[PDB]
Subunit: 817 residues, 2 copies
C-alpha cells in the first residue's frame, strides 16, 4: 500500500477543467431528444439535465475517489479484495491512473440526447466517446504525455466510455466508471431496501463490506451536499421485494418456502392458488443475503436530521440545487466539504464527547507548583548550580522535570501574576552569566541573563516584559531549542540550570501569551519538524493504521476499533508539553525552515487555544486533546533532497485522552517549605538547659563570711549571720539539686531593700547588688521549672489529645508558687 | 651530734619525786629553827613553814635544770656553739642519768637552812644540806646505788656540789645547773625588776645562748604563775636607780656626768657610801642603754607587763593569797602537777604563735563539691547497676578512677558522710551483692585475694537494722587487714596496682564509715590518743630529724619572736599527712600499739583544744578523720627501747593545731561539675510540641473534599442540601484551602466562625450528608489546629522567651496568661 501523493478531485485543475468542458459543451445544454427534454427549475434557476447532468457526473467522480480511498484502507486492514487478470486490486490504483478515470467519467454521459435508458445506449455512448476524444484533441498539448501517455492510452479510456461489450470487470477503469455510475442510482425509488441491497452487493466483492458501507454512507452525505433526496431504510418493511436485475419478483409458495430452481419471476406472470411474492423483510432475512448484507434488523431515517418534511422539501427546491447542476466550482465545493466531514465524524463518534472547550481548573499539584515557581522567581538567591535551595528544602533536576511532564503549564501560568512577570528581569540579572547551549553542538554557548539585558529587554512595564519573553522564545534558537527539548523530555546533556529555566519560563511564557494575544484563534495551523527517516516512518505507519480504522458506516459501527487503534498509534505527544510554534502560512515551515515533516493541524472546534506571537502562533496542547491524523501525503522534496510529508491532524477533545498521574509531586515539597523554624522556642530549651551560676553564689557566701566576722558592729554582723547567709546556703542547695520547692520558698526569705539600707557602708551596698542578682537568678529558675515548663508540657499533652481548648487553658491558667 | 632523748622527765621520774618527797618530809616541811623569817605564814588557812626557800622553790629549780638542758640541746641542733667545760662538753651533752643525779642534789640544796638569813651562815647551811643528802643516799643505798649513783665517789661528787666549798659554779654541768637553777628563782618582784633580770640573764647566756636563755626566763615566769608567785614587770625606761646585784651596789654619774669608769670598766659604789653634790645614781634606763649591755641583753627598748594577763590587780592578789599557793609549798604531787601543766603549755603556745589563730573547734560546713559528692555517692548507692569494671555511668555521665581519687583528696569525707542517711547505709547490702565477686587485695602481697561482697554477706554482717550495719562496717574497717590496708593506701594516695573498684569502694565506704562512726559513738572525746605504725628504718629516721628540726625551732621568748622560723620549719618538715585522708585507728591505751601490734613507731596524739573529733570504735579504740586545717605538730621525740623483733621503737608526741594556714587550696567544680550535667533536662514534651507544629496539613484532603462537594452538589438530593453545599460549605473549603496554602492565620481564624453549625447540618439526614459532616469536622479540626498554634500558642511562647531573654519574668508570665482570642 504505497503512500498517496495528495491528489484530489477537489484540487486537481486538469480534472476540474475536464468537468467544465463537459458542462460547457454538453450537459449544460438542452436535450435535443424527446424524453425529459423539458427543463426543470430550482429556485428560479433552470436545469436542462436534472438527472444525468453535472451534479450526477461530479458525484460519480467523487465516488471513484472514495472507493479507491476505502480499498487502500481495507488492504491495509488485511482484507482480501477482488483481483483482476493481472492480479491487481482497486487498491493498487495510482494517482495518475485515477485522474484518467475521472476525466473519462466527466464525459461518460455527455453524449446523451435525452433520458431514454431502454434504447440508444450504443448511440449515446458513441457520442460520449466522440465528445471525450474531441476534448483530448483540443487540449492535445496539455494532456499528453503528462496526463495520458499516448494515443493508445486515450483510446483505452475512450473504449471504456463507449462500452461496446460491457466488460465491466476487465480493469479498475471499467469498474470505477461502472460502479460510480451505479452508486448514484440509489435514490428514492421504492422499495429503497431492494435498491440499496443490490448496488451494495455489486460493489462489495471489489472493496469489502466495511469499505462498501463507508461508500454508501458517504454517498448519502454527498446527496445532502448536492440537494438530492435521501431514502430511509426499514428491514421490517412489508412491501413486496423488487428484484432489481430485470425489475422482477421472488415468490412464496405453500410449502412456505421461497421458490427456488433462486427462481426469478416476472411481474406479469400469474401465480397459483397459494403463491405470493416474497416481501423485502423476508428477503433481508435470507441466510444468503444476511451473509453479504448487514442491513438485517436495522433502520435508517430519510431526509435530514433536524429538518421536517416541509423544511426538507423546501431545501430540495433551493437555488443551490441548480448551482450544483450549473456551477462546477460550487458543486465541487459542496462535495469537498462533505468529503472532509466524513473523515472527522467517525473520529468524534469513537470517543466520549465533551461540552467544555476550555482547559480544566487547576489540580492540587498545579496550584502548589505555581506557589513554588512564584517563590523562586522572588528569591533567585535560592538558585545554585546543582540544585535549588528554598526554605530548608532542596529541589533538584528530577523535581522540575516532573513538573514539566505532569503539570499543564498553561494552567500553572494562569495562577501567576504580574509580580512574577516583573521578577523575570531579576532572575535574568542573577543568571547574567549562566550559559545556555543550543541543541546544535556547533553553536557557541550564550550567556542567558546578559543577552536578555543587552539585546532583548527594552524597559517598560510588565506587558513589555511579556512581549520580550515571547520574543526570546520566538527568535533565539540557542534558547528555544534547548527549552523545547527539555520540556518534551527528549534532550541530551542539559545542565540543571537549563532544566530549571525551562520549568520556570514555560508557565510564564504561557501567561505572557494569554495576556498579550488579541486575535481570535485561527482554525488551520501549520507546524514544521525535522525528523529522522526512522522516526518519520514510524509516524507515517501509525497514521496510516489510524486512518485505515476510521471509516464511515451505514449499519456496522466500528468505533471500538477506531478507539483501539488511535490509542495504540497516537503520536500527539510530539506536539505536546511545550510552547509549540505554528503558522497560518504553510510556506513558513515548508520553504523558509525547509522541514521534511509538516503538521497541518485542524482545530474546527476551537480546542487548542493558540496564542498569537508578536504569522506565528503558539500552541500548548491541553492534556485531553489528541491530534488525530486523517491524511498523509508525500509533498515532494526539501532543499536538501530529503522526502517531505504533510500530516493533516484534527484536534479532538475527550476525557478518554486524559492522563492519570499520581498526585503529591508538587504538593509535598511545598508543605515542607511551610514548616516553621520556631527559633524562639529552640532558644527557650537551650536556656532551660543552662547550668546555674553557682560560683556567683559561692563568691557572695565567701564575701559574707569574711565580714560575717571582721567587724565590731553587732547589728550588721547578726543581719549577715541570721538573714543573709542562710538564704545563700538555701539558694545554693536549691540550684544544685534543682529543687523547685526549696527555690520558691527562699524567695520570700531574701531581705528587703530597707533591711539592707540600714547599713550605709560601701561593702554592704555592693553586696546588696550581688544579692539582688542571685535573687533574680533563683527566681528565673523557680518560674521556669516551676510555672512555665510544666505549663508548656500540659499544653502539649492536650494537643496530642486534640483538646485544643485545654491546650490554651494550660497557658491561661498558671498556678502561683 | 645530739643523741635522742629517752623521755626522762622531772614530772614522771619516780626517783626524783621520791627525793623531793623526802626533802619536804624531813626538812622543808618543818619549821625554821632560826631567827630571821622563821615565822610561818598562812595561805587560805594552810600554814607554810618555808615561804621563800621551800618546796615550791626547790621544785622550780629542778624544773629550770630540765628546761635549760632542753633548750641547750635545741641550741646545738640550730647549729649554735655553746660554752664548753674542761672536758670539752656543753650543757647539751648532759645525759638523762646525769640529769637525774643533778635533780636529786638540787632537791637538798636548801634542806640545811635554819632560817632565811642573808649573808651569815652560808657554809653552815650548805654543810647541813650536804649531810641531809648523804643521809638520804645511805638510807636508800639499796635502791640508789648503783642504779642511780655509780659509787660513793659519785655520791661524794654531788655532795661536794651541794656543799659549795670553793664557789666553783662553772666547774661542771652539775655546778652550773645547781647554781644557775638556784639563781633563776631569784628573779622575784624585788625592785628594780630590770636590774635583776638583766643580771641572771647574763650569767646563763654564755652556757646555752640568747635564744635558749630567753626561753628559760620566759618559761620561768609561767612556772611562777603556776606556783602562785608574783611576776614582776619589765620597763626599760624605769627612772629608778640601777642596782648592781653583785654587791647590791650602784653606779655613779658625775657632773660630767658620764658614768664613772676605771682602767673601760664599771664600778660598784656601796649603797651605804656617800658622795659629792655634783653626782647622782645611774638610772635603770641609763644602764640598759649602754652599748655593752645591749650587745649581751636583748631587752631594751622593750616592756613586759606584770601579773596575769586578763586579771586586774585586786584579782591577782586574791590569787597570790589562794590556798593553792600553800598546796604548792606542801604537796609535792600538786606542785609538780602545776609545773608539768605549765611546762607542757610552753611547748604548745609558741606553735600557735607561728600561725593564724582559729576560734572554732568544729569541722566547717559542707562546701559545694562536698554537697555534690554526697549526692553522687547516694545515687551510686541507690542504683549499683551503674557500676562497671572501668567506670561508673550515672545519668549520662562517665565517672572514672581519677574522679574518685579527687573526692578522696579534696573532700572532707567526714563532712560528706554527715550528708548521708540511713537509706544509704541500708543500701550497702545492695551494693555488696552487686560486688559479690569483686576481689579485694591487701597491700601485703603474700595474702590471698578476698571476695568483697561474699565475705561481707557471709562473715561480716549479722542481720538487724541500720545501726547493726554501721557496727558491721566499722568492724570490717577495724579488724580485716585485707580491707583496710587497701582502703587506707588509696585514701592516702600511696597505693600501687589497685583496681578501679577498690578505688570506688574506698571513695564510697570512707564517708559511709565516718557517718557510721558519728552515729554510733557516744564516748566523750579523749584528749590523748595513741597510734602505732610499722615504718621502714629509712622513713622513721626522716620523720625523726623532721621532728627534731621542728622542735629545735620552736621556742618561747621574752623579747625576740622567732615565730617566722617556726612557721618555715613546720611547713618544711610537717608529716601530718601520715594521719590524714582516712579513718585512722587510734587507742587511749599505749599498750595496744606497743605490745599487741608491736609497732616500731608510736604517735602520742594530743588534742587539748578538741579539734580532732574522734569517734569510739565498738573500750579504748577510736577513729579520727583529720580535718583539712589541722596539723599534728611534734613537740617531743623519745627513744622507747626495742620491739619484739629487736628494732628500735620511738614515740612521737604530736599536738593538734588548727589554722587557716593549714587550709589546702583546691579548685572547685571537681564534683559539682559532673553533677550539674547529670541534671540537664531532656525536655521531651517541648520537643514534641515543636514537632507537632512541624506536622503538615493534608491539603490534598481539602482539595479532594472540594471535588466531592461539587460532585455531591450537581445532583439535587435533599432540600436544600444542594444549596447548602453551594452557599455554605464550598466557600468555607475554598477559604480554608487558601488559608492553609498561605500561612495566613487571619484567614484561618475567620473561616473557623464560618464553618456551618451542627444545627444547620441537622437539617439533612441522608447517608451522604452525614458522611459530609464527618469530613467537614476533620477539615475544621485541621484549620483550628493551625489557627490556634500559629495564631495564639506559638507567638505566646515566643513572647515569653523574649521577655525571659530580657530577664523580665513579669512579662514572661503575661505572655502565657494574656493570650487574646481570635
Amino acid at each position: 500500500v504505497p503512500t498517496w501523493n495528495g491528489f484530489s478531485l477537489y484540487t486537481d485543475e486538469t480534472v476540474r477543467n475536464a468537468a467544465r468542458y463537459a458542462y460547457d459543451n454538453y450537459l449544460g445544454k438542452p436535450y435535443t431528444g424527446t424524453v425529459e427534454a423539458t427543463p426543470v427549475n430550482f429556485g428560479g434557476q433552470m436545469v436542462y439535465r436534472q438527472h444525468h447532468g453535472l451534479a450526477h457526473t461530479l458525484r460519480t467522480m467523487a465516488y471513484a475517489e472514495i472507493i479507491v480511498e476505502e480499498a487502500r484502507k481495507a488492504k491495509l486492514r488485511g482484507e482480501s479484495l477482488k483481483t483482476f487478470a493481472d492480479g491487481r486490486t482497486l487498491a493498487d490504483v495510482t494517482p495518475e491512473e485515477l485522474r484518467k478515470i475521472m476525466i473519462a467519467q466527466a464525459f461518460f454521459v455527455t453524449g446523451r440526447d435525452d433520458e431514454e435508458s431502454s434504447k440508444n445506449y450504443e448511440k449515446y455512448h458513441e457520442q460520449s466517446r466522440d465528445a471525450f476524444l474531441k476534448y483530448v484533441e483540443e487540449n492535445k498539448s496539455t494532456l499528453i504525455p503528462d496526463v495520458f501517455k499516448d494515443e493508445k492510452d486515450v483510446k483505452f479510456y475512450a473504449d471504456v466510455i463507449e462500452d461496446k461489450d460491457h466488460k465491466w470487470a476487465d480493469s479498475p477503469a471499467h469498474v470505477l466508471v461502472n460502479q460510480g455510475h451505479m452508486v448514484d442510482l440509489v435514490r428514492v425509488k421504492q422499495p429503497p431496501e431492494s435498491y440499496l441491497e443490490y448496488y451494495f452487493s455489486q460493489l462489495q466483492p471489489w472493496i469489502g463490506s466495511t469499505a462498501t458501507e463507508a461508500v454508501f454512507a458517504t454517498q448519502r452525505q454527498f446527496f445532502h451536499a448536492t440537494y438530492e433526496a435521501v431514502a430511509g431504510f426499514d428491514s421490517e418493511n412489508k412491501e413486496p421485494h423488487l428484484v432489481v436485475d430485470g425489475l422482477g419478483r421472488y415468490v412464496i409458495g405453500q410449502d412456505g418456502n421461497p421458490i427456488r430452481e433462486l427462481k426469478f419471476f416476472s411481474q406479469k406472470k400469474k401465480l397459483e392458488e397459494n403463491q405470493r411474492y416474497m416481501r423485502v423483510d423476508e428477503y433481508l432475512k435470507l441466510d444468503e443475503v444476511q451473509k453479504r448484507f448487514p442491513g438485517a434488523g436495522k433502520k435508517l431515517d430519510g431526509g435530514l436530521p433536524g429538518l421536517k418534511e416541509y423544511q426538507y422539501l423546501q431545501r430540495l427546491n433551493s437555488i443551490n440545487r441548480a448551482r450544483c447542476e450549473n456551477d462546477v466550482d460550487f458543486c465541487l465545493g459542496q462535495l469537498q466539504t462533505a468529503h472532509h466531514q466524513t473523515k472527522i465524524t467517525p473520529i468524534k463518534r469513537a470517543f466520549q464527547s465533551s461540552s467544555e472547550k476550555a482547559r480544566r481548573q487547576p489540580n492540587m499539584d498545579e496550584i502548589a507548583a505555581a506557589r513554588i515557581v512564584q517563590q523562586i522567581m522572588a528569591n533567585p538567591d535560592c538558585i545554585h548550580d546543582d540544585h535549588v535551595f528554598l526554605n530548608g528544602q532542596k529541589l533538584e533536576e528530577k523535581f522540575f522535570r516532573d513538573l514539566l511532564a505532569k503539570c499543564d503549564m498553561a494552567i500553572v501560568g494562569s495562577l501567576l501574576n504580574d509580580t512574577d512577570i516583573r521578577n523575570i528581569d531579576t532572575l535574568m540579572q542573577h543568571e547574567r552569566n549562566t550559559e545556555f547551549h543550543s541543541t546544535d553542538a556547533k553553536a557557541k554557548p550564550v550567556k542567558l541573563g546578559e543577552t536578555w539585558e543587552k539585546t532583548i529587554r527594552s524597559g517598560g512595564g510588565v506587558t513589555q516584559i511579556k512581549h520580550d519573553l515571547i520574543f526570546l522564545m520566538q527568535n533565539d534558537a540557542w534558547y528555544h531549542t534547548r527549552v523545547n527539548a527539555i520540556a518534551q523530555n527528549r534532550d541530551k546533556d542539559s545542565t540543571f540550570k537549563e532544566v530549571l529555566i525551562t520549568a520556570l519560563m514555560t508557565p510564564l511564557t504561557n501567561k505572557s501569551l494569554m495576556d498579550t494575544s488579541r486575535s481570535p484563534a485561527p482554525k488551520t495551523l501549520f507546524r514544521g519538524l525535522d525528523l529522522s527517516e526512522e522516526f518519520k516512518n514510524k509516524l507515517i505507519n501509525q497514521a496510516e493504521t489510524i486512518i485505515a480504522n476510521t471509516t464511515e458506516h451505514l449499519f456496522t459501527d466500528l468505533s471500538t476499533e477506531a478507539f483501539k487503534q488511535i490509542k495504540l498509534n497516537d503520536f500527539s505527544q510530539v506536539s505536546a508539553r511545550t510552547c509549540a510554534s505554528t503558522s497560518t502560512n504553510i510556506e513558513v515551515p515548508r520553504t523558509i525552515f525547509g522541514s521534511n515533516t509538516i503538521f497541518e493541524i485542524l482545530d474546527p472546534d476551537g480546542l487548542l487555544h493558540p496564542k498569537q506571537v508578536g504569522s506565528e502562533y503558539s500552541i500548548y496542547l491541553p492534556e485531553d486533546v489528541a491530534l488525530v491524523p486523517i491524511k498523509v501525503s508525500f509533498d515532494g522534496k526539501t532543499g536538501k533532497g530529503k522526502d517531505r510529508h504533510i500530516f493533516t491532524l484534527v484536534a479532538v477533545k475527550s476525557p478518554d485522552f486524559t492522563p492519570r498521574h499520581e498526585s503529591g509531586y508538587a504538593v509535598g515539597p511545598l508543605l515542607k517549605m511551610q514548616t516553621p523554624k520556631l527559633e524562639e522556642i529552640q532558644r527557650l530549651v537551650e536556656q532551660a538547659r543552662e547550668e546555674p551560676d553557682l560560683e556567683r553564689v559561692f563568691n557572695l557566701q565567701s564575701r559574707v563570711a569574711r565580714q560575717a566576722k571582721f567587724s565590731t558592729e553587732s547589728g550588721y554582723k547578726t543581719f549577715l549571720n541570721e538573714k543573709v547567709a542562710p538564704v545563700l546556703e538555701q539558694s545554693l542547695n536549691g540550684l544544685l539539686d534543682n529543687n523547685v520547692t526549696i527555690l520558691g520558698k527562699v524567695l520570700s526569705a531574701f531581705p528587703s531593700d530597707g533591711q539592707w539600707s540600714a547599713f550605709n557602708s560601701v561593702e554592704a551596698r555592693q553586696m546588696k547588688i550581688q544579692m539582688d542578682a542571685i535573687k533574680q537568678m533563683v527566681e528565673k529558675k523557680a518560674v521556669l521549672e516551676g510555672q512555665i515548663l510544666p505549663a508548656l508540657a500540659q499544653c502539649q499533652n492536650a494537643l496530642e489529645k486534640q483538646n485544643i481548648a485545654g491546650a490554651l487553658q494550660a497557658l491561661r491558667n498558671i498556678p502561683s508558687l
